[PDB]
Every structure is written in C-alpha cells, then in structure tokens.
C-alpha cells in the first residue's frame, strides 16, 4: 500500500507531467503499480442510460483549434495568502502565513509545474494533471481501492457530480434508493428527471441493511410502476441531516446486500474527514495514525467496482471554489467525463491553480492532513457546544436527540403529539411550520425535518448545524430555540 513517504519515489518512477495547454491525462498516469496487481471491475453496460451510451468524444504549425492566445488574458500574477502548517487560524495566517504567486512564464522560469497561461486557458474534462495527480494520490493514500481500473475525474462540485451520475444511470420512470431522511438537494435533483425515490429505513447509525434487502427482495414492477432500482444514494459519514455515521460493520453488511441485488453505491461523502470522538461531559501520533482512525469508506471495500464516490472541497477548504471530483470504475468515469465536455467542461482554472499551489506545492499531503486534523479538532469543540446547550436549555420532555460522532448536523426529535392538537388545526405539518416560524421570530434559523423526507406522519425533527454560526453564538442560538419551543408548546 502507498504511504506519504512513498509518493516522492512514485513521482520519480513515473512519467513527467505535461505542462502545455489542455493536455490529455488520466489517474493511470498517477496510480502506483500495486493497483494493477488487483482484479478488474465488473461491467455496467446494462445500467448505462441511452443518453449516456449516445455520448461521444468531439512538430508542426497548427491553425486547427479555437484556443485563444494568453496575450489577451489580462492577469499577469495571482497570489493567495495561506496558513503555514504550524498555525491554521485566521490570526496565525495573518501573522506567519505564506504568499503563493502563480505567474505567466512560471513553467519557462522553472518556478512552477502549473503555468497561469495554462490555468487561464481551456482545460480538459478531467481537470488539470497538476490537481488530478494530488486528488488521485489522495484517493490512493486514504481509500486504497481494491480493484485495478479505478479513476478520478475533477468536477464543478458534488451537486454537478450527482446531476450527471443521475443522467448516466437513470431514465424517465426509474426508481433510486435513498435513506428515509436524506439531502433535500439530492431528491430535488432527481424528481424533475422522472426518477422516483424508494425510501429504506435507518437507525441512529444510519441506513438499515435489512430494510434495503426487504425493499429490493419484495419489489414488484406492477405495483411500483417501474423495474427494481439498481442505484443507492447514501451519506455513510455525518448523514445529512440525521448525522448518523455507519460503523465498519454496517458498511460491510450494506455492501453484501448491494452484491446480492447488484446495486451501484453512490457515496456522497462531504464530511468524511469530520470524524470526531464520541461526545463526553466536557493527539494523532502520526499521519498514518490519523488515516487509520477514519472508519473505512465503501470505495475501500469496493471489491466489485460498484461504487461512485462524490468528493468535494466545499466542506474542507471552500464551497466558493466549486471544485470536487468523482471516484469510480474507468467505464463509468469515462461516461461522466463526456457529460462534462458538453456541460460544465471543468472546474474554474483559477480555482484549480490556487488549490494546486496550496495542496501540492505549499502544504503537500502532510500539510493537507495536518489541516484536516485541525478541522477535526475545531468541529469537535463546536459539536460539544451544541449538545451542551441542547440539554442545558431544551425541554427534555418534548425534545430528544443523539449526540453525533461525525459531520456538522444535529438531529432533534420533537414529540409533536404532546401539544394541543386535540382541537382546531390538528395537522402535524401545521405544528412544524409554527415551530420553524416561531424560531426565526426569536432569531434562530433551523431546517424543517419535512424537507429531508424521501416519503408518513410520525415524530417531527429539526436539523441544526454547528458549522454556520460563530462558536460563541452556538449556546445563545439553542437557548433562543429552547425559548421558541416552550412558547409554541404552551397555553
């Protein structure tokens, strides 16, 4: 297996990076030999949409292509001030931060492997080799996929990733499998395409393998109006919005069912590196130790090559950058890339060169992992504050909650039936709108559990992130919400 200490050698022993405009690359330029001793992935021809199968590809002097001259790109230099690994706080970066300059002629001047003229011009649909090498190495270091022909493709984000895998696998009048309570934007992306959602139940630890098996085993084309679904959308770590994180045992169990029913697993994992210690009343010995500490992903267990892993920089570095990637078997990744060519094309070149300078040249794999440890330490303090505030202010007779292990979401259950629903407007939805609107008026924003339902009126929940608000404000916000609850649940 590839370790941080093996990367300098892998690069020495592998082909040079092409530093000209929009060069052909793949992950295969960057993968370690070990990868090719593993078996090949299963084929998925039968699962490709008619749209997706239809998609196709587009020393001498060239007057051939429509690439403009960098002369008429009016950016000579792009600089960013970034934290130097010791200190990662805004105060520390101001104090001791490093300035990274990307110049035109950087490649001629031997300064950089990513020229601003190249970053400012058109790119390929897989993204720059400069950034794809880091993403590929990162994928190998963290997940180490157990099949030979895995590949990364850079993205305009997981939102675009999900839209374009939905188009790749699904047709008008198909079902896909989601968790009881899922990401609203994921469902929001699926419906307009004619894709229906068959929900599968979950516990405090997330997706239940029994329910998944039960839905797929008990599937009748006639009643549902469509064929057995073969796509599973799931958030394994810090589930949106429950915050439930599957342990290794649940994931192995889920993978078995997917093997039996021949499912493609789409793991959307934005908070994968936000795994914290379990909450208590009130450190990683090495980078190998930190990586070992992370509960393994579906990609890690992906013996069959049936997994698409949606990764993003949004919850790790910046949602603004609109930069992510997909990890999957060559055949599906190749299909995704064609959709990018006639769509988003690639994430912004300025986004790519700023990320590459920080991740590749400055931080490296060490500095990046150092930053994710700090992000783990940060979100831990915030996780404690929201749970401490919840039980010190919230009415325990009306509100119930499990403290979360990973993510930035807190799931609060509300006994909606312990409020005067005997007379007048006895609609669970009515108490919901009331409880939400009563919260803004006492000055707190929360997410309505009903937005996250994949589709039944039982208990009601509220989603409360501990990422959005200043650490000091976390306590004040829950109190404000506690007050709202008491008022609304009163005379």
Q: Answer yes or no: is 72 a known binding residue.
A: no
Any contact of residue 45 with a copy of itself (CB under 8 A)?
no
Q: Which is nearer to ligand PLP, 277 or 345 (CB)?
A: 345
Q: Minimum Å distance from CB 65 to ligand PLP?
A: 9
Q: Answer yes or no: is 322 a known binding residue.
A: yes
Which sign, positive or negative, has the C-alpha torsion 449, 294, 164, 67? positive
Q: Which is nearer to a copy of itself, 44 or 466 (CB)?
A: 466
Bond preceding residue 241 cis, omega within 30 of 0: yes
Which among 268, 244, 264, 242 is positioned nearest to 254, based on CA atoms?
264
List beta partners, residue 98: 82
Q: From the list ligand PLP, a copy of itself, none, pick the one residue 54 interacts with, judged by a Cβ distance below 5 to 8 Å according to partner type.
A: a copy of itself
Distance separating alpha carbons of residues 65 and 70, to the nearest angstrom: 14
Q: Which is nearer to a copy of itself, 200 or 444 (CB)?
A: 444
Beta carbons within 10 angstroms of residue 314's beta carbon: 17
Q: Minimum Å distance from CB 317 to ligand PLP?
A: 11
Task: Report 224-263 residues binding a copy of itself (CB under 8 A).
Answer: 240
* Concatenated DSSP letters of 401-433: EPPPSBSSEEEEEE-TTSSS-SSS---HHHHHH
Distance separating alpha carbons of residues 107 and 114, to the nearest angstrom: 7
How far is C-alpha 385 from the geometric centre of its chain's CA atoms?
A: 24
Any contact of residue 82 with a copy of itself (CB under 8 A)?
yes
Q: Answer yes or no: is 122 a known binding residue.
A: yes
Which among 395, 324, 440, 366 is positioned nearest to 7, based on CA atoms?
366
Beta carbons within 10 angstroms of residue 420's beta carbon: 12
Q: From the list ligand PLP, a copy of itself, none, pick the one residue 324 interacts with, judged by a Cβ distance below 5 to 8 Å according to partner type.
A: ligand PLP
Give the residue, chosen from 54, 223, 456, 490, that forms a contact with a copy of itself under the rule CB under 8 A.
Answer: 54
Any contact of residue 25 with a copy of itself (CB under 8 A)?
no
Any contact of residue 346 with a copy of itself (CB under 8 A)?
yes
Q: Which is nearer to ligand PLP, 144 or 237 (CB)?
A: 237
Q: From the list ligand PLP, a copy of itself, none, pick the one residue 466 interacts with, judged by a Cβ distance below 5 to 8 Å according to partner type.
A: a copy of itself
**Cα-based torsion angle of the residue sequence 266, 227, 195, 126 in order, rounded to the nearest 10 degrees:** 40
Q: Answer yes or no: is 155 a known binding residue.
A: no
Give the residue, chosen from 290, 371, 393, 411, that forms a contact with a copy of itself under the rule CB under 8 A.
Answer: 371
Distance separating alpha carbons of residues 130 and 354, to the nearest angstrom: 11
Segment near a copy of itself (CB under 8 A); pick from 33-41, 137-145, 309-317, 421-429: 309-317
Q: Which residues bind ligand PLP (CB under 6 A)?
A: 66, 157-159, 183, 235, 240, 268, 270, 312, 314-315, 319, 324, 345
From residue 93 to residue 122, the character string flagging contacts with a copy of itself as x (rule: CB under 8 A) and all else as - is: xx--x-x----x--------------xxxx
Any contact of residue 314 with a copy of itself (CB under 8 A)?
yes
Distance separating alpha carbons of residues 407 and 292, to the nearest angstrom: 18
- Residues belonging to the chain: 491
Q: Answer yes or no: is 159 a known binding residue.
A: yes
Task: Report 381-400 residues binding a copy of itself (CB under 8 A).
Answer: 386
Identify whether the C-beta of residue 222 lies closer than 8 Å to the C-beta of residue 187.
no
Q: Report phi then psi at 70, rounded to 5.
A: -55, -20
Structure tokens at 249: 């045992």
Q: From the list ligand PLP, a copy of itself, none, pick the one residue 235 interacts with, judged by a Cβ distance below 5 to 8 Å according to partner type.
A: ligand PLP
Positions at the binding site for pyridoxal 5'-phosphate: 122, 158-159, 183, 240, 312, 314, 322
Positions at the binding site: 122, 158-159, 183, 240, 312, 314, 322
């Amino acid at each position: 297996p590839l370790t941080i200490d093996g990367i300098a050698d892998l690069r020495a022993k592998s082909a040079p990076i092409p530093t000209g405009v929009a060069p052909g690359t793949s992950s295969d330029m960057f993968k370690s030999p070990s990868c090719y001793t593993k078996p090949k992935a299963k084929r998925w021809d039968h699962y490709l949409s008619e749209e997706s199968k239809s998609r196709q590809q587009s020393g001498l002097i060239s007057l051939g292509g429509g690439l403009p001259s960098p002369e008429y790109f009016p950016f000579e230099e792009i600089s960013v001030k970034v934290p130097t690994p010791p200190g990662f706080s805004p105060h520390e970066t101001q104090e001791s931060g490093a300035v990274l300059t990307a110049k035109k002629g950087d490649v001629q001047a031997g300064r950089s492997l990513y020229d601003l003229e190249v970053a400012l011009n058109y790119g390929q649909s897989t993204g720059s080799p400069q950034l794809l090498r880091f993403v590929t190495e990162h994928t190998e270091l963290i997940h180490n996929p157990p099949y030979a022909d895995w590949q990364c493709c850079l993205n305009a984000g997981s939102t675009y990733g999900w839209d374009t895998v939905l188009r790749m696998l699904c047709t008008r009048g198909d079902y896909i499998l989601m968790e009881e309570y899922t990401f609203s934007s994921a469902k929001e992306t699926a419906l307009p395409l004619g894709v229906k959602v068959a929900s599968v139940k979950m516990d405090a630890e997330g997706l239940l393998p029994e329910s998944l098996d039960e839905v797929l085993s008990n599937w009748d084309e006639a009643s549902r109006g469509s064929r057995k679904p073969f796509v599973l959308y799931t958030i394994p770590t810090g589930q949106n919005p429950t915050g439930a994180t599957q342990q290794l045992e649940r994931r192995k169990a889920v993978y078995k069912v997917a093997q039996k029913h021949d499912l493609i697993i789409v793991e959307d994992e934005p908070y994968y590196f936000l795994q914290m210690q379990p909450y208590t009343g009130p450190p990683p010995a090495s980078h190998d130790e930190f990586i070992k500490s992370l509960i393994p992903s579906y990609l890690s267990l992906d013996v069959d090559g049936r997994v698409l892993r949606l990764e993003s920089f949004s919850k790790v570095l910046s949602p603004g950058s609109r930069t992510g990637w997909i990890v999957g078997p060559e055949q599906l990744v190749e299909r995704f890339m064609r959709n990018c060519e006639t769509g988003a094309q690639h994430p912004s070149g300025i986004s790519q060169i700023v990320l590459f300078k920080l991740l590749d040249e400055h931080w490296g794999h060490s500095g990046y992992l150092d930053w994710l440890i700090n992000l783990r330490m940060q979100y831990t303090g915030r996780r404690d504050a929201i749970v401490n505030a919840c039980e010190k202010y919230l009415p325990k007779e009306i509100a119930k909650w499990n403290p979360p292990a990973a993510g930035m979401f807190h799931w609060i259950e509300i006994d909606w039936q312990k409020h005067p629903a005997v007379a007048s407007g006895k609609s669970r939805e009515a108490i919901e709108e009331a409880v939400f609107h009563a919260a803004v008026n006492n000055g707190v924003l929360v997410s309505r559990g009903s937005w996250f339902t994949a589709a039944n009126e039982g208990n009601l929940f509220f989603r409360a992130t501990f990422a959005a608000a200043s650490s000091e404000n976390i306590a004040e916000a829950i109190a404000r919400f506690a007050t709202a609850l008491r008022t609304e649940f009163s005379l």
